[PDB]
């Protein structure tokens, strides 16, 4: 019965085209198993200066293995990567690390952009018991009251790491729809290997996007989907003003070494508990402390540092696309317009405008690292006007 | 463009576009000038702890 | 103990030789082919920039400017990069050009180097006989097999071939080398101790060393010539030549060439002539280290999980021979998985001494693509067995002599210990039990001191 | 006031006391061990030291065997 | 307001010199310092195992109702209080 | 181990290099590149493993001066690794024939660059920006050439000789921030004017 039936599952799998060329097409189906969803982007409108809120379910669902030795191990490790790749892409923003554990919510790291503080917090978050049940109501309470004091010229989005369990919290979180719909705060959850309808209704009543974790690769995808600053609901803001351009200071300008250290509890700046020698300078406090391209606590305006953060999204929107042809128009001497090679896996990648020939390793290098076709350069800037 | 078109490729002019030790000494000079800045309060701290 | 310099010696090859000979004899080592030889067998990055000025520096720059080229960071590394470059005798310390010593290179090398930098259609560049591809009569991967099999008929006939080597007088140099030897009846081409070490080596630079020592056995030809020719080999391959090695001939240049097809690295046709051929495998000689390219054959992964030697891959018989010395006694079927012994392979180092790294080297040389997806350190047990054979080897040590008795008074024996220690016949002093070591070599001197001490009563 | 002479062997004390037993189990008269100290250092009449490179390890392995 | 300035010695060290160096008053201390954390910093003692407890603790009130003859009085809610906080 | 690749971006403004000849200089474009050539060879003189990348900035394009783009290297593509079985250029080497293996290919292609004096594209000046990535894709492939115990130490040289052009400021800035991802050093020698923008790079 089953001793045969356990091995009727092997009968077909093991066997293939016999005689010659065996265990060959089994490898071909594995390549045919590949090539999942690429981009499907092309959007406009919103996404600028997010104010994210990490919300972590700490529950007994973590004790199931399912991808890793812990579901936090699946979670927490790639959050650091998600932190770094965020600060890579979006430095104009800041993130609220808030942890739910034992039916409450602990705002673990404040809404800020200092990566080491966030990452070591995750390195502190390693040895978490995740005792108790999830409570989103305490999480939204922090999320309200913090972002309540943020301007309406702020992007208001929440990223919830939920372990798909029972949403164990009172006090009419169904009525928190109209609370937060009016409060123009977006809330995005993704479910860990299952679905919560109420939370699924929550996000579809939000405009925040809900998903379910499939796999570790798939876990990365939706992170990567939420790296990009999304086009949230209309009528948020237009502008955001008193973007402080700073100065770097060399502390060697006119008076050479007239100050042994530029942090002595009286100097304009010197914000954090450490010694400094003068590296930076804000306009409004005239605040000189450790360099930070974010904001301050006395002038209270945004320490904008343009080549970093006014450059990041500044080309992250205006992209175009390529096309693929299997044909052989042999442009070059059977070459690439970029790296100049050939393999011909029938993916001859042609630009939409300048129409230049590329490979996967030239398409990926654009579509992950270069983000534009340089074949448009020499082709845009010469007749540009 | 048409003039030094031919001048590069021959490389007899560009055989000896190197031997100017006249322009080595000055090239050694601002090296050595920037090799030793001096007189700028080396001990700048040491009252900073107080 | 045992010799350990005969394995590597990869900067001293151009130093201990060169500094062991005259400046005028190494002035001969500034042939224009010998220019690339200088820069590469030394590997400092720090002296490798101290050269770079001198093509633009005819002038002797002052010493302090480069003595203070690099500050507080790595002053020793600057100093370690300095006197060795000076120890090449390529520099001249000027006296007082402007008031103080300002160093400078030998210009005749600067003459020789700049032709190998820009310009020059000279004798090695062109105009006399350098090189010549006329029409393809013979191909390189076919000759790569020659560049493999001559190594075999070298390396197998070291161990001993059921086949035979070609008619060489090289064995009478390799028996002379102390790699091989032969007792007088029939002259058996065995291994003494050192070819065994070179069996454990894999680069051609040892061959090169005995080929540098080729003229040393009372031969008087161009040592200047052959080391130019040692570079003149190092030209990749792809050149037949309209007998261009005879148009650029010399005496030893053609005769010792007959040996380079004995050494296999040249390939000579009918009449040992009409062309020349440099072989592809010349890169290994320069590196003189383990090397990722030094993989010979790519069998597979190994492991020694559960220290039980754990591997397969039916290979050639030389690897089978490489473990015929190293694993018999429960050999198995087609996959070469002779089990493990913590005594026999331990006894199989007694005729070698410790093969400590030579385990670890043949750990990464048993099946060669093992470091592709494995852990960086595989065995915490093979290293320990080699350490136990180290302590046993330390116990084994030996020397020669005889004994004397009745030392008597304590303060008088301490004075005699300093007599044998200064001359170098006493390794150490047994002060507490009054025992003294004297080699037979120093017998007359030690006995004369003892008689003098007896007279001084 | 004695030339003496000998071959120095350095080893752990475990074996430095053992060579006394090899002196007592020498087939010839004592030659391997003129005297011993707390310090790991001995002196041998240099005759069979090359044999004692292997005569010791062939012996200690066998004695422990039974 | 006074338990806030005693349980936190760093803010108390801040609160000292406004009395020590006579910078400002306590009336001025609670007038322009806090003003936001009256909802944020006071969001700890009010929630406490999700107050207005309806569907969070009720899952666990029956399994954690008894350890032993005296396994009670843990902390504040320990194992008896939210039973009272519903009926 | 490592391979130690070099990247070199040379300014070749024939407007300015013509202007370099307008002063009747004691340093011309012929005198320029030959230093830069041996500079590229100087890289090679530290190690056989060393690899070079050279691309000037023509008014209409930036062709890979080194390695090549013609039938002398369209079928040759260098000797070490994946050999073409090509005898003559695959024969002579060792510190001096490697350079004349590459000496030819620059002067032949700058000939192809300095035969195109026919600019009518409204002073299409120094096109550094798109010229930059032409390396960066290629070394990405060269990253994918071998990496197995092979750290790619790439190093980017930029040479400036003239003014910058009027190119897209975003497309100026981004690739540096992409090079900020790329973890490769970029070094810059200018000749005539200062570039506050490129010194920010
Ligand atoms: Zn201010
Ligand atoms: Zn491509
Ligand atoms: Zn394009």
UniProtKB/Swiss-Prot annotation, chain A:
Organism: Homo sapiens (Human)
UniProt xrefs under Gene3D superfamilies: von Willebrand factor, type A domain, Zinc/RING finger domain, C3HC4 (zinc finger)
Quaternary data: Component of the TFIID-containing RNA polymerase II pre-initiation complex that is composed of TBP and at least GTF2A1, GTF2A2, GTF2E1, GTF2E2, GTF2F1, GTF2H2, GTF2H3, GTF2H4, GTF2H5, GTF2B, TCEA1, ERCC2 and ERCC3. Component of the 7-subunit TFIIH core complex composed of XPB/ERCC3, XPD/ERCC2, GTF2H1, GTF2H2, GTF2H3, GTF2H4 and GTF2H5, which is active in NER. The core complex associates with the 3-subunit CDK-activating kinase (CAK) module composed of CCNH/cyclin H, CDK7 and MNAT1 to form the 10-subunit holoenzyme (holo-TFIIH) active in transcription. (Microbial infection) Interacts with varicella-zoster virus IE63 protein.
SUPFAM superfamilies on file: Cysteine-rich domain, vWA-like
NCBIfam families: ssl1
InterPro entries, per the entry: C1-like_sf (IPR046349), Ssl1-like (IPR007198), TFIIH_C1-like_dom (IPR004595), TFIIH_SSL1/p44 (IPR012170), VWF_A (IPR002035), vWFA_dom_sf (IPR036465), Znf_C2H2_type (IPR013087), Znf_RING/FYVE/PHD (IPR013083)
UniProt entry tagged with the keyword DNA repair: yes
Modified residues (Phosphotyrosine): 86
PROSITE patterns: VWFA (PS50234)
Zinc finger (C4-type): 282-299
Principal cellular location given in the protein's record: nucleus
Gene behind the chain: GTF2H2
GO biological process, any: transcription by RNA polymerase II
Listed result of changing residue 367 to A: No effect on the transcriptional activity of the reconstituted TFIIH complex
A GO MF label: RNA polymerase II general transcription initiation factor activity
SMART domains, alphabetized: C1_4 (SM01047), VWA (SM00327)
Name of one Pfam family that matches: C1_4
Protein family (similarity comment): Belongs to the GTF2H2 family.
From Swiss-Prot, chain B:
Parts forming coiled coils: none
Subcellular localization, as worded in the UniProt entry: Nucleus
Post-translational modification: (Microbial infection) Upon Rift valley fever virus infection, interacts with NSs leading to ubiquitination by the NSs-FBXO3 E3 ligase and proteasome-dependent degradation.
Family per similarity comment: Belongs to the TFB1 family.
Subunit comment: Component of the 7-subunit TFIIH core complex composed of XPB/ERCC3, XPD/ERCC2, GTF2H1, GTF2H2, GTF2H3, GTF2H4 and GTF2H5, which is active in NER. The core complex associates with the 3-subunit CDK-activating kinase (CAK) module composed of CCNH/cyclin H, CDK7 and MNAT1 to form the 10-subunit holoenzyme (holo-TFIIH) active in transcription. Interacts with PUF60.
Cited function: Component of the general transcription and DNA repair factor IIH (TFIIH) core complex, which is involved in general and transcription-coupled nucleotide excision repair (NER) of damaged DNA and, when complexed to CAK, in RNA transcription by RNA polymerase II. In NER, TFIIH acts by opening DNA around the lesion to allow the excision of the damaged oligonucleotide and its replacement by a new DNA fragment. In transcription, TFIIH has an essential role in transcription initiation.
Name under which the protein is recorded: General transcription factor IIH subunit 1
Species annotation: Homo sapiens
UniProtKB/Swiss-Prot annotation, chain D:
Main localization (coarse): nucleus
InterPro entries for the chain: TFB5-like_sf, TFIIH_TTDA/Tfb5
Bilayer-spanning residue ranges: none
This protein's UniProt keywords: Cytoplasm, Disease variant, DNA damage, DNA repair, Ichthyosis, Nucleus, Phosphoprotein, Transcription, Transcription regulation
Alphabetical list of SMART domains matching this protein: Tbf5
Gene Ontology, cellular component aspect: cytoplasm; nucleolus; nucleoplasm; transcription factor TFIID complex; transcription factor TFIIH core complex; transcription factor TFIIH holo complex
Compartment(s) of residence: Nucleus; Cytoplasm
One annotated GO biological process: nucleotide-excision repair
Classification via Gene3D superfamilies: TFB5-like (3.30.70.1220)
Disease (UniProt): Trichothiodystrophy 3, photosensitive: A form of trichothiodystrophy, an autosomal recessive disease characterized by sulfur-deficient brittle hair and multisystem variable abnormalities. The spectrum of clinical features varies from mild disease with only hair involvement to severe disease with cutaneous, neurologic and profound developmental defects. Ichthyosis, intellectual and developmental disabilities, decreased fertility, abnormal characteristics at birth, ocular abnormalities, short stature, and infections are common manifestations.
UniProt family annotation: Belongs to the TFB5 family.
Protein's name according to its UniProt entry: General transcription factor IIH subunit 5
Organism, scientific name: Homo sapiens
UniProtKB/Swiss-Prot annotation, chain F:
The keyword DNA damage is assigned to this record: yes
Keyword Transport among UniProt keywords: no
Species of the source: Homo sapiens
Name listed for the protein in its UniProt record: General transcription factor IIH subunit 3
Source organism superkingdom: Eukaryota
Molecular-function annotations in GO: RNA polymerase II general transcription initiation factor activity; zinc ion binding
Coverage span on the entire protein: 6 to 206 of 308
Role according to the record: Component of the general transcription and DNA repair factor IIH (TFIIH) core complex, which is involved in general and transcription-coupled nucleotide excision repair (NER) of damaged DNA and, when complexed to CAK, in RNA transcription by RNA polymerase II. In NER, TFIIH acts by opening DNA around the lesion to allow the excision of the damaged oligonucleotide and its replacement by a new DNA fragment. In transcription, TFIIH has an essential role in transcription initiation.
Compartmental location: Nucleus
Gene Ontology biological-process entries: DNA repair; nucleotide-excision repair; regulation of DNA-templated transcription; transcription by RNA polymerase II
Gene Ontology CC: core TFIIH complex portion of holo TFIIH complex; nucleoplasm; nucleus; transcription factor TFIID complex; transcription factor TFIIH core complex; transcription factor TFIIH holo complex; transcription preinitiation complex
Family: Belongs to the TFB4 family.
Keyword line: DNA damage, DNA repair, Metal-binding, Nucleus, Transcription, Transcription regulation, Zinc, Zinc-finger
Subcellular location, principal: nucleus
């Amino acid at each position: 019965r089953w001793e045969g039936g356990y091995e009727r599952t092997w009968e077909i799998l093991k066997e293939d085209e016999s005689g010659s060329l065996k265990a060959t097409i089994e490898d071909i189906l594995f390549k045919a198993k590949r090539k999942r969803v690429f981009e499907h982007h092309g959007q406009v409108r919103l996404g600028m200066m997010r104010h994210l809120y990490v919300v972590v379910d700490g529950s007994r669902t973590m004790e199931d293995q399912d991808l890793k030795p812990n579901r936090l191990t699946c979670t927490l490790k790639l959050l650091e990567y998600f932190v770094e790749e965020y600060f890579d892409q979006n430095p104009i923003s800041q993130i609220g690390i808030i942890v739910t554990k034992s039916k409450r919510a602990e705002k673990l790291t404040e809404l800020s952009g200092n990566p080491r503080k966030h990452i070591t917090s995750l390195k502190k978050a390693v040895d978490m018991t995740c005792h108790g049940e999830p409570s989103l109501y305490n999480s939204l309470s922090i999320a309200m009251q913090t972002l309540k004091h943020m301007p309406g010229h702020t992007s208001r989005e929440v990223l919830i790491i939920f372990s798909s369990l029972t949403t164990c919290d009172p006090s009419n979180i169904y009525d928190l729809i109209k609370t937060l719909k009016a409060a123009k705060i977006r809330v995005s959850v993704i479910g860990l290997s299952a679905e919560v309808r109420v939370c699924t209704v929550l996000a579809r009543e939000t405009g925040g996007t809900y998903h379910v974790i499939l796999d570790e690769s798939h876990y990365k995808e939706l992170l990567t989907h939420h790296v990009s600053p999304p086009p949230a609901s209309s009528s948020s803001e237009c502008s955001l003003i008193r973007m402080g351009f700073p100065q770097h200071t060399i502390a060697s300008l006119s008076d050479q070494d007239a100050k042994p250290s530029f942090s002595m509890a009286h100097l304009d700046g010197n914000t954090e508990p450490g010694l400094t020698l003068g590296g930076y300078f804000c306009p409004q406090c005239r605040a000189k402390y450790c360099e930070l391209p974010v904001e301050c606590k006395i002038c209270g305006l945004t320490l904008v540092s343009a080549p970093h953060l006014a450059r990041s999204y500044h080309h992250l929107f205006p992209l175009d696309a390529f096309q693929e042809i299997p044909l052989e128009e042999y442009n070059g001497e059977r070459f690439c317009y970029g790296c100049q090679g050939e393999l011909k896996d029938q993916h001859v990648y042609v630009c939409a405008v300048c129409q230049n020939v590329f490979c996967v390793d030239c398409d990926v290098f654009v579509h992950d690292s270069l983000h534009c076709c340089p074949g448009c350069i020499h082709k845009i800037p010469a007749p540009s006007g | 463009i048409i003039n030094s078109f031919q001048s590069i490729r021959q490389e007899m002019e560009a055989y000896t576009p190197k031997l100017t030790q006249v322009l080595s000494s000055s090239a050694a000079s601002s090296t050595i000038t920037a090799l030793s800045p001096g007189g700028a309060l080396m001990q700048g701290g040491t009252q900073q702890a107080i | 103990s045992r010799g350990l310099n005969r394995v590597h010696l990869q900067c001293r090859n151009l130093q201990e030789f060169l500094g062991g000979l005259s400046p005028g004899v190494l002035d001969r080592l500034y042939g224009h082919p010998a220019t690339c030889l200088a820069v590469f067998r030394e590997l400092p990055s720090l002296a490798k920039n101290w050269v770079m000025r001198m093509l633009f520096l005819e002038q002797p720059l002052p010493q302090a400017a480069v003595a203070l080229w690099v500050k507080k960071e790595f002053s020793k590394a600057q100093e370690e990069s300095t006197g060795l470059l000076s120890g090449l005798r390529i520099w001249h310390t000027q006296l007082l050009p402007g008031g103080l010593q300002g160093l400078i290179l030998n210009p005749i090398f600067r003459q020789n180097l700049r032709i190998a930098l820009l310009g020059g259609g000279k004798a090695w560049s062109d105009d006399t006989s350098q090189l010549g591809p006329d029409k393809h009569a013979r191909d390189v991967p076919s000759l790569d097999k020659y560049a493999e099999e001559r190594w075999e008929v070298v390396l197998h006939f070291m161990v001993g071939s059921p086949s035979a080597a070609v008619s060489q007088d090289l064995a009478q140099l390799l028996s002379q080398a102390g790699l091989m030897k032969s007792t007088e009846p029939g002259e058996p081409p065995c291994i003494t101790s050192a070819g065994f070490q070179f069996l454990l080596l894999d680069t051609p630079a040892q061959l090169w060393y005995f080929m540098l020592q080729y003229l040393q056995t009372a031969q008087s030809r161009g040592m200047d010539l052959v080391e130019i020719l040692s570079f003149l080999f190092q030209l990749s391959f792809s050149t037949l030549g309209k007998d261009y090695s005879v148009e650029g001939m010399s005496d030893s240049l053609l005769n010792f060439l007959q040996h380079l097809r004995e050494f296999g690295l040249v390939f000579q046709r009918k009449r040992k002539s009409r062309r020349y051929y440099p072989t592809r495998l010349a890169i290994n000689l320069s590196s003189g280290v383990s090397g990722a390219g030094g993989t010979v054959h790519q069998p597979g992964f190994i492991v020694v999980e559960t220290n039980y030697r754990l591997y397969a891959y039916t290979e050639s018989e030389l690897q089978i021979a490489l473990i015929a010395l190293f694993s018999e006694m429960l050999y198995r079927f087609p996959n070469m998985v002779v089990a493990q012994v913590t005594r026999e392979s331990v006894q199989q180092a007694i005729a070698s001494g410790i093969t400590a790294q030579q385990i670890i080297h043949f750990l990464r040389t048993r099946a060669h693509p093992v470091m592709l997806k494995q852990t960086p350190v595989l065995p915490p047990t093979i290293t320990d067995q080699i350490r136990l054979w180290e302590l046993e080897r330390d116990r084994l040590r030996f020397t020669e002599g005889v004994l004397y008795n009745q030392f008597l008074s304590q303060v008088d024996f301490e004075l005699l210990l300093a007599h044998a220690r200064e001359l170098g016949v006493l390794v150490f002093e047994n002060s507490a039990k009054r025992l003294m070591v004297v080699t037979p070599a120093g017998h007359s001197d030690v006995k004369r001191f003892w008689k003098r001490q007896k007279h001084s009563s | 006031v004695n030339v003496l002479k000998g071959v120095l062997i350095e080893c752990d004390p475990a074996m430095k006391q053992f060579l006394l037993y090899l002196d007592e189990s020498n087939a010839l008269g004592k030659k391997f061990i003129i005297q011993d100290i707390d310090d790991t250092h001995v002196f041998v009449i240099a005759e069979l030291v090359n044999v004692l490179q292997e005569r010791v390890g062939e012996l200690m392995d066998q004695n422990a065997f039974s | 307001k006074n338990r806030m300035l005693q349980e936190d010695p760093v803010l108390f060290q801040l609160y000292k010199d406004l009395v020590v160096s006579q910078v400002i008053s306590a009336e001025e201390f609670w007038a322009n310092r806090l003003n936001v954390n009256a909802t944020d910093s006071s969001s700890t003692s009010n929630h406490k195992q999700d107050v207005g407890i309806s569907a969070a603790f009720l899952a666990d009130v029956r399994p954690q109702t008894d350890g032993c003859n005296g396994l009670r009085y843990n902390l504040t809610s320990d194992i008896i209080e939210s039973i009272f906080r519903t009926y | 181990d490592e391979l130690n690749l070099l990247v070199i971006v040379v300014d070749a403004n024939p407007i300015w290099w013509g202007k370099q000849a307008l002063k009747e200089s004691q340093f011309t474009l012929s005198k320029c590149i030959d230093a830069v050539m041996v500079l590229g060879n100087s890289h090679l003189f530290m190690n056989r493993s060393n690899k070079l990348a050279v691309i000037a900035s023509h008014i209409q394009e930036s062709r890979f001066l080194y390695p090549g783009k013609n039938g002398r290297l369209g079928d040759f593509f260098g000797d070490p690794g994946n050999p073409p079985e090509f005898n003559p250029s695959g024969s002579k080497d060792g510190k001096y024939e490697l350079l004349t293996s590459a000496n030819e290919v620059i002067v032949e292609e700058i000939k192809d660059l300095m035969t195109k004096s026919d600019i009518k594209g409204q002073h299409t000046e120094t096109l550094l920006a798109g010229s930059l990535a032409k390396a960066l894709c290629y070394i990405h492939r060269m990253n994918k050439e071998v990496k197995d115990n092979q750290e790619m130490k790439s190093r980017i040289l930029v040479i400036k000789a003239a003014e910058d052009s009027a190119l897209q400021y975003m497309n100026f800035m981004n690739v540096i921030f992409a090079a900020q991802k790329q973890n490769i050093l970029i070094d810059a020698c200018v000749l005539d004017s200062d570039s506050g923008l490129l010194q920010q790079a």
